[PDB]
Symmetry: C2
Subunit: 149 residues, 2 copies
Amino acid sequence: IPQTMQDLDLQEVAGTWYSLAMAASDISLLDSESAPLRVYVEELKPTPEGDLEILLQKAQKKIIAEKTESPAEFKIDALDENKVLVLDTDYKNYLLFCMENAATPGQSLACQALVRTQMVDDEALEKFDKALQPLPMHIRLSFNPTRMA
Amino acid sequence: IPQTMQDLDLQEVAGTWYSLAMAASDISLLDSESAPLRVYVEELKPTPEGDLEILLQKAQKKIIAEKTESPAEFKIDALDENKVLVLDTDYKNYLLFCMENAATPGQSLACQALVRTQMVDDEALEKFDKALQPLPMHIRLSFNPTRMA
């Protein structure tokens, strides 16, 4: 399991994001545009309470991630996953997160690199690959954010 | 455009191989088991003349790669590709190659890491990623060689 960010300022992740890259432990989770975890993030909507709404494109999808005692871990109930982990962000340019089913990570771990603009950002990708370096990924995809936007 | 091995001893690549990892410039080339370049190498069969027969599983497939003046470049007429390039090998453990359509690389470049045993070999994977590092890949897959075998 990836380590989560210390000192996440949750309200600062608000607004528009684009999915630049995705990676997963199981090829089947990401392998076509209709694969279960091929979801493209369009907005992060933190709530006054400290929870995190995630709006996605597949068709639109709305996932609410409920806060926990760890500022960077959230609970969900969607996509056959139950946890969202924020690995790292600088709020203004890139954000890295993963989703897993905490009771079966090896069939469920899927991570993304999100960016604030429709540009490919090679530094965000380097940070994404370093984050994934010890994780057991079998598919990694990178996108031109323009296409889905 | 990846560079090819100097001093390829072609006859030494003969015999059984397994596809450990695949990567491609276009996601669609590799994205399902029925993707055009999702082909699993089972044997490399060099010919007396210096050409290179490649046996693959999708269903079996036989590709004959014809020699050129470059010992590590071959010509093919299959999978909508026309060139096979041997990037690096040590004959006894791992081999890296790419196929491309020399007239449209960005839509066709697909590379693999092959291994001699049904084991995951993390060093062959590191060499494969290093070979890929400046190439424009958008999908990378890695396999347990046991499965297809």
